[PDB]
Chains A and B, each alone.
With several copies, the nearest count.
Chain A
Amino acid sequence: YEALRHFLLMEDGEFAQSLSDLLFEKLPGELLNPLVLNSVLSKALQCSLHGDTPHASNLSLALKYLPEVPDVLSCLELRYKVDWPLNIVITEGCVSKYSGVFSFLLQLKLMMWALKDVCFHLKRTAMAGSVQFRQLQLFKHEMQHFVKVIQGYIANQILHVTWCEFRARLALEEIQRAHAEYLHKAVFRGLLTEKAAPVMNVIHSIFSLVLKFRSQLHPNFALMQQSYNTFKYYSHFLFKVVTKLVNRQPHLEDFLLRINFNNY
């Protein structure tokens, strides 16, 4: 379990920061055929100097979103393969959700890649006090601030509070239930569940506008200004929707907390 956490919850230094950056170069035929996704993992584990375990190799690897391209979905699934003397405890529907939480997690880094791209496209323009540079980068900061704090919520819920559970349980029917309740609460506090689904729903509008903001690199200053203008309305609308669903969730109260300190 404490090996699975390294490579599907990405508890590894510059493994996410090296897998995601190589994967997102593609979106074509690349990152579809089984010789390219077959080799990005062998490069990613070696440049983190934490991996290269048998819990990180000889595991099955595929994808569920093909690159056909906005694109708010990441790709490259990873599965943790188990067999008979591990099957009595570790479930094979539980592992499909291990892949499912890894994919959501890599999609979170997709925004941290896209905003980095548009700040990188802007970098060669300047240092200077030219208006088209400074007033454009002021938009980027806000979206990066949004991404870091929704990430600060997720990096607490799926990784600390649910990881306390089933770690003080390891300090015949029972061990399966202790495993499944742990992953069940991990996907529950991640707000992917149907109960807190409208809270995560507006983040996709957030994310699509971040992609529109990434695509352009300034004559096209006004278009990116307008994309940011739609983004700010959607954030000010999220501020009410998350508050209303604490009368439905004390765990969600940390999220309304996260996105704003004071402020209306």
Chain B
Amino acid sequence: REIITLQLGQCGNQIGFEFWKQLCAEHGISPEGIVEEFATDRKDVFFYQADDEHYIPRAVLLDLEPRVIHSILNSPYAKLYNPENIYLGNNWASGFSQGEKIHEDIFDIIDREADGSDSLEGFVLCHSIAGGTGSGLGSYLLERLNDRYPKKLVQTYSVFPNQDEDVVVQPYNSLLTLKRLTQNADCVVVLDNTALNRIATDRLHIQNPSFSQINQLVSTIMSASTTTLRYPGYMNNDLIGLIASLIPTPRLHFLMTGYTPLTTDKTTVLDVMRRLLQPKNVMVSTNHCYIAILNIIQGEVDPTQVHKSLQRIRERKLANFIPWGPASIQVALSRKSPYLPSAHRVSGLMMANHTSISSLFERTCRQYDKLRKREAFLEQFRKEDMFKDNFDEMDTSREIVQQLIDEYHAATRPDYISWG
């Protein structure tokens, strides 16, 4: 019923610490984990039922060679949580082998927290790709969660590892990780470092401190995606009911991200609807078409004019679509986030299955094919050779992602009645 949250990798632990500081700010709770008189919300989603009726969040921290985890530890939000779920090489095979050798005690920590909760609903993975040891270890951990719990749901918050150029084995890492994400995950929420960097240089003139502000954007997106569960609404107060609508088939299960405010330093519903449809507002970077779109809206918004707006967007005919299937845009509304003062109160978020992500996948495949034909940028490791002697695992993952590209472009067609 309760979801166990994991932060994995070094950069993933950074954005997880940002997200838990964000939850300390969002709910009416102290940095010691203490429920206050300024806290009525739901606390059975990410909060471990800690013992003094103080709903302490679940921050399962798994890592090897911790450096930024120490700076996370010397913080007043390490008194918000510590049920001892914190635990103490830039290639995929190295992190894979590191996850393989110490699987048992970290899986004992996982079973420990799973028995600690009243029940289980899913494992959400808070990660940033290309964190060094985080990649590879993340795919192995994803395989362990998928193998051990085939009746639960796994969500993957992931960035697209592209800063437009150092790790040159990064296309290999993302290629193998994407093969594992196709088969060991039920839904993956993908963000783009390129589009987030472009939007950050769009809103202000920051290029040096941009990473910390992108962490704030990621934390707010993560809060907005789970506000409908953490605060009592009527729909998408469960994970699976939210996930089931957007995914037609378990290989096309990657969702783009968008967010209506650009700066954070009345607004009617028609504005935010066609605002969220524009690709300037999508934080993810030929014919390409959405499969299904769903939006959450949380702010000073009248729930009656949304049918007038949706009528206007319908007769506008503003997006094309996958033109053989009964899919629609799906309008959903949740509560404005309480117990903290927020500027720019109206903020909406979209998760949509778009075949445009196959273009970036094909870009990564083209980069992988170029570096593979050259073969001077695998940076040859003993981990990489020992994990696979003939290096056919990247070719098998290439076959998987080629099948994915074919399925994407067949879904782009009006004929996907048979699989292609």
Contact = CB atoms under 8 A, between A and B. Distances in A.
B151 interface: yes
Given A127-B183, A127-B184, A151-B235, A156 B307 contact: yes
Interface in A124-171: 124, 126-127, 129, 131, 134-135, 137-138, 141-142, 144-146, 148-149, 151-152, 155-156, 159-161, 164
Contacts of B40: 50
Contact of A262 (B44, B321, B333): B321
B325 to A, nearest CB: 8
Interface residues of A, number: 55
Q: Which of the listed residues B232, B307, B315, B329 has the most CB atoms from chain A within 10 Å of its own CB? A: B307
B150 interface: yes
B83 interface: no
Interface in B184-242: 184, 229, 231-235, 237-238, 240-241
Contacts of B327: 145, 261
A65 B321 CA distance: 36
A146 B326 contact: yes
Interface in A36-53: 39, 42-43, 46-47, 49-50
B306 A156 contact: yes
A112 B156 CA distance: 24
B419 interface: yes
B275 interface: no
Contact of B249 (A124, A134, A257): A134
A10 B231 CA distance: 14
A58 interface: no
B184 A261 contact: no
B326 A13 contact: no
A160 B232 CA distance: 15
B315 A42 contact: yes
A184 B403 CA distance: 54
Contacts of A123: 150-151
A18 interface: yes
A258 interface: yes
SS of A interface (majority): helix
A259 interface: yes
Contacts of B146: 127
Contact of B1 (A12, A18, A129, A148): A18
Nearest to A144: B244
A235 interface: yes
A14 B233 CA distance: 10
Nearest to B305: A161
B137 to A, nearest CB: 21
A11 interface: yes
Contacts of B229: 13
B233 to A, nearest CB: 7
Given A13-B231, A127-B183, 7 more contacts: A17-B241, A112-B241, A141-B248, A145-B292, A156-B307, A160-B304, A257-B314
Interface of B: 1, 40, 42-44, 146, 150-151, 183-184, 229, 231-235, 237-238, 240-241, 244-245, 247-251, 292, 303-304, 306-307, 310-315, 317, 319, 321, 323, 325-333, 403, 419
* 3 interchain residue pairs of minimum CB distance: A160-B303, A254-B307, A13-B232
